[PDB]
Amino acid sequence: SDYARDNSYTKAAEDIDAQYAYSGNDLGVTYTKDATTFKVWSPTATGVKLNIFTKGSDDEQGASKVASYTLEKMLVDGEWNGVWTITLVGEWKDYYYTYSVTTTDTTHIGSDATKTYETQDVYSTATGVNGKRSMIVDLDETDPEGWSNDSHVLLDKSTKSSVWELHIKDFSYDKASGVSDANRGKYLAFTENGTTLNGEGKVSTCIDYLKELGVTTVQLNPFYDFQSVNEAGDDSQFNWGYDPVNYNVPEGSYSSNPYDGKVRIKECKEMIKALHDAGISVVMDVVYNHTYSTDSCFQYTVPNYYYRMKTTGAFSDGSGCGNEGATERAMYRQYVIDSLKYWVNEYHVDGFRFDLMGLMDVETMNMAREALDQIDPRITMWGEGWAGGDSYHPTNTCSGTKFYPATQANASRLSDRIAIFNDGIRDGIKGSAMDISDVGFIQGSKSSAKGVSYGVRANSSGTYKWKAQAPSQCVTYDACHDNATLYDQIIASTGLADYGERNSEAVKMNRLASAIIYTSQGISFTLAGEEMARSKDGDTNSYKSAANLNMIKWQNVVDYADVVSYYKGMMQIKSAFSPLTAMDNSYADKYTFTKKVSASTNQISFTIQNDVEGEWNKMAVIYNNATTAADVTLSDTSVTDWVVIANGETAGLDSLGEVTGSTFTVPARSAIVAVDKAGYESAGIHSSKGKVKVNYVYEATGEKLEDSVILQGSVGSGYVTVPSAVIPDTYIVSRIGGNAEGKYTSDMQEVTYYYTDYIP
Ligand SMILES: OC[C@H]1O[C@H](O[C@H]2[C@H](O)[C@@H](O)[C@@H](O[C@H]3[C@H](O)[C@@H](O)[C@@H](O[C@H]4[C@H](O)[C@@H](O)[C@@H](O[C@H]5[C@H](O)[C@@H](O)[C@@H](O)O[C@@H]5CO)O[C@@H]4CO)O[C@@H]3CO)O[C@@H]2CO)[C@H](O)[C@@H](O)[C@@H]1O
Ligand SMILES: [Ca+2]
């Protein structure tokens, strides 16, 4: 819950805002060749001392204290504006610095109740190792080659996105990634083109893999500077990084050199440029809701101002991490908005994911949306519309408006282009994220059907659990970095196999999840590697678990190539059919559900009427979670000539067969997507991908030992097939027909694994 409570701390902070709020835009360092100016906002301080150093830490060669200087109160018409300033004449680039701040707290201003704290700059743009000393940098020197020609990659519509949620270490830490020794688990991994599995040259990994998969967007887990990895320590350390230290400095551990402050800036920019060169939008995970500790640059500069304080003097702990940032305060609001603008402008970031956005006030969020709109309204914003504990806040903001938290409950007060994670469809698809053993729709829960069905229109049509204003305000997903991976929950909730073990029924459920995500409105989102059955060995909170547990297992692009192909195809379907990628509510009344949206059912079906010329006229979608094939008759009989474009085997833009009438046979634990024949013919939307069909046959009888699968990819790109992992160990491959490995062609190729009797 959140609580409106006014106290001595909130009153003091409000009075500080009225007298001392500063909008000068020049806090921190203003560098030029001829002089550097330093500015610190601290109304509570009795003095601020600047300390210059040759190095970011004392252990480095050439490390020494240069000198210290007294900052002076900044006067405007002889009135103090709360700012401290000094200008050092000459060339000061590449020196390091801290401030020594002698200060009261917010409730004892003018008293002699002072303490002195040493801290890095609140407005640091660079630091040395482990973020303890700021660095004076010419940011133009940190620009990689071609950076001036690097542009934002922005989606016309947020709802046309396909988001891959990725940790920078996870991306390439696996030696099988084919990334060079130097760059594995680093920013620079993204700059390596032509990477293949085990560097064997047969099938793409990393950035080339992402190009082939066709994701629009990569959302990167924390790459601001966090506390929880020792940047001078072992390469085997792992943390998600939800432990902020410096908001406007890149994390050191993902760089080749954290000791020189400029290197991580250059390399972070190189990562972003490489994603842009691949045609991929970059979204940044940001965590303004809390800092690692209250022994922070914020608390050491203006004690008790930047955090929400309870009447009893305790820090409000709405984050569950010990503190919460006071977004309702004039100078934290300004800090956050200025920070967002900085990452967009300086680093070419294309959008943001707000950690525990429910701890941020609606007015601040809306003002941030308006700020980013002035750059480009296609810059994306979304976040978690919840908190991690009870939140204590003042009644009103620094603007004098009533405080509202940016939660699901308050979606109507928030901009429709600040989207909110839809836990409705997430839990509906695969079961409660809070319990890995819990079943959702794909595993056979009939009561979960309503979660899926509301999810289909991005929880914007009617009300189940919460209501989005529009599809633009909804992130559609079945899993993220938190809790269990999709495939781990499937395995745990069914007992079908061990974690990370292929099972044919588990894989069917995984394909069905794919069909649902890409036939639902809202912003389609996946954990990186969901498309290849990513496992964390059942770990439901992997934030500091082993690097090799967390890392993407690149062998899975082969072991689950068929599943990758299914996702690849479903993505094509969504991007081809306008109703699915609508921002607004235009298409809400164009859906005809066969059963009530609320129905307890094994078969969900609906049609969608389109109005875009040159596209399919109508789509039929069926989800079957039964363990048997079902005959499903649509209530909408307006179309009786259909072309199937997704089934239990494959998804894409090509005809998989036709259906006359209103009844479809839907295999167990599978989806059907069909479109009107007339529209299919007229639109001329067709696949340019090639296919490989993989068969598994008992040589002696000619009978299949396992269902055939379909691989699908760009013509001329490399594929690798393998024997079926689920065939009993009492059969072994004796012969292969066709090419187990090769390049896709337009005409479908077939590979048959022939099996003989064996004892293991
Ligand atoms: O600080 C404690 C906590 O922090 C982190 O948890 C985060 C979660 O991992 C993350 O998923 C997110 O949690 C959200 C959740 O996703 C969202 O769905 C909503 O949760 C609801 C449930 O949907 C609802 O079922 C009910 O949950 C019950 C649960 O069913 C029952 O089995 C039992 O465990 O009690 C639960 C709570 O009563 O209610 C919850 C809460 O309303 O909201 C959640 C946020 O509150 O964000 C979490 C916070 O960052 C860590 O990962 C975790 O290890 C720590 O324990
Ligand atoms: Ca760090």
Q: Which helix (H) or strand (E) holds 269?
A: helix 261-277
Number of H helices and number of E strands within the chain? 15, 35
Residue 624: CB within 6 Å of ligand 1?
A: no
Q: Which two tokens stand for residue 753?
A: 């694994």
Question: Closest residue (by CA) to atom 29 of ligand 1?
Answer: 434
- Burial profile 387-396: b = 16 or more Cβ within 10 angstroms, e = fewer: bbbebbbbeb
The upper half-sphere exposure of residue 231, i.e. CA atoms within 13 Å in the direction of its Cβ, equals: 26
Residue for token digits 């790109």? 717
User: Distance between CA 59 and CA 50 in Å, rounded?
Assistant: 21
Atom of ligand 1 nearest to the CA of 541: 52
User: Distance between CA 474 and CA 417 in Å, rounded?
Assistant: 9
User: Distance between CA 636 and CA 607 in Å, rounded?
Assistant: 7
Residue for token digits 């990167």? 220
Which mutation among 434, 486, 493 tests ligand 1's pocket best, with the greatest number of atoms within 8 A of CB? 434
Breaks in the chain, after residue numbers (C to N greater than 2.5 Å): none
Instruction: For residue 120, give the DSSP letter.
Output: -
Q: Which helix (H) or strand (E) holds 375?
A: helix 362-375
- C-beta separation of 480 from 165 below 8 A: yes
3-state secondary structure of 8: helix
User: Distance between CA 165 and CA 188 in Å, rounded?
Assistant: 18
Q: Which two tokens stand for residue 396?
A: 């009103």
Instruction: Considering only CA atoms, give the Rg of the chain.
Output: 28
What is the distance in A from the centroid of ligand 2 to the CA of 229?
A: 6
Residue 435: CB within 6 Å of ligand 1?
A: yes
Q: Which two tokens stand for residue 196?
A: 């293949």
Residues, beta carbon < 5 Å, ion ligand 2: 225, 252
What is the distance in A from the centroid of ligand 1 to the CA of 386?
A: 9
Question: Closest residue (by CA) to atom 42 of ligand 1?
Answer: 386
CA dist list (Å): 386 to 360, 408, 469, 646: 10, 7, 17, 35
- C-beta separation of 71 from 37 below 8 A: no
Please, what is the Cα angle at 655 between 653 and 659, to 5 degrees? Answer: 130
At the topology level, CATH places domain 158-578 in: TIM Barrel (3.20.20)
Catalytic residues: 355, 384
**Method by which the model was determined:** X-ray
Provide the 10 A C-beta neighbour count for residue 193: 13
Residue 388: CB within 6 Å of ligand 1?
A: yes
What is the distance in A from the centroid of ligand 1 to the CA of 434?
A: 6
Residue from 652, 654, 674 nearest 662 by CA = 674
- C-beta separation of 523 from 382 below 8 A: yes
| Amino acid in position 9 | Y
Atom of ligand 1 nearest to the CA of 426: 18
What does the longest C-alpha to C-alpha distance in the chain come to? 98
What is the distance in A from the centroid of ligand 1 to the CA of 485?
A: 16
What is the distance in A from the centroid of ligand 2 to the CA of 232?
A: 10
Which mutation among 2, 165, 386, 539 tests ligand 1's pocket best, with the greatest number of atoms within 8 A of CB? 386
* Phi (first) and psi of residue 19, to 5 degrees: -90, -35
Which residues, at least 6 apart from 549, have a Cβ–Cβ distance to it below 8 Å?
536, 537, 539, 542
User: Distance between CA 535 and CA 515 in Å, rounded?
Assistant: 20
Enumerate the β-bridge partners of residue 367. Answer: none
User: Distance between CA 559 and CA 170 in Å, rounded?
Assistant: 18
Residue from 257, 707, 234, 248 nearest 511 by CA = 707
Residue from 406, 723, 442, 759 nearest 602 by CA = 442
CA dist list (Å): 2 to 286, 391, 400, 500, 508: 22, 5, 18, 40, 42
| Amino acid in position 617 | N
What is the distance in A from the centroid of ligand 1 to the CA of 482?
A: 10
End-to-end CA distance of the chain: 58
User: For the packed helices 261-277 and 330-347, what is the interaxial angle rounded to 10 degrees?
Assistant: 60
Enumerate the β-bridge partners of residue 523. Answer: 475
Residue 390: CB within 6 Å of ligand 1?
A: no
Residue from 352, 357, 354 nearest 391 by CA = 357
Residue 716: CB within 6 Å of ligand 1?
A: no
Q: Which helix (H) or strand (E) holds 644?
A: strand 641-646
Classify residue 328 by burial, with Cβ atoms within 10 Å: 0-12, 13-18, 19+: buried
Q: Whats the size of the chain, residue-wise?
A: 760
Which residues, at least 6 apart from 213, have a Cβ–Cβ distance to it below 8 Å?
164, 531, 564, 567, 568, 571
- Burial profile 558-597: b = 16 or more Cβ within 10 angstroms, e = fewer: bbbbbbbbbbbbbbbbbbbbbbbbbbebebbeebbbbbeb
What is the distance in A from the centroid of ligand 1 to the CA of 427?
A: 12
Atom of ligand 1 nearest to the CA of 435: 32
What was the resolution (in A) of this experimentally determined structure? Answer: 1.8
Residue from 378, 495, 509 nearest 442 by CA = 509
Instruction: For residue 318, give the DSSP letter.
Output: T
Tell me whether strands 731-737 and 689-698 are parallel, antiparallel or unpaired: unpaired
Atom of ligand 1 nearest to the CA of 388: 49
Residue 434: CB within 6 Å of ligand 1?
A: yes
- C-beta separation of 520 from 580 below 8 A: yes
User: Distance between CA 273 and CA 347 in Å, rounded?
Assistant: 9
Provide the 10 A C-beta neighbour count for residue 84: 25
Ligand found nearest the CA of 250:
2
Atom of ligand 1 nearest to the CA of 482: 9
| Amino acid in position 526 | T
User: Distance between CA 394 and CA 397 in Å, rounded?
Assistant: 7
Enumerate the β-bridge partners of residue 606. Answer: 593, 621
The edge-to-edge listing of strands for the beta sheet with 618-624 is: 591-593, 603-609, 618-624, 670-676, 641-646, 658-660
Residue 482: CB within 6 Å of ligand 1?
A: yes
User: Distance between CA 166 and CA 155 in Å, rounded?
Assistant: 19
CA dist list (Å): 79 to 19, 74, 83, 112, 387: 11, 8, 11, 21, 41
Tell me whether strands 419-421 and 474-476 are parallel, antiparallel or unpaired: parallel
Ligand found nearest the CA of 359:
1
Residue for token digits 């542009």? 151
3-state secondary structure of 271: helix
Instruction: For residue 56, give the DSSP letter.
Output: S
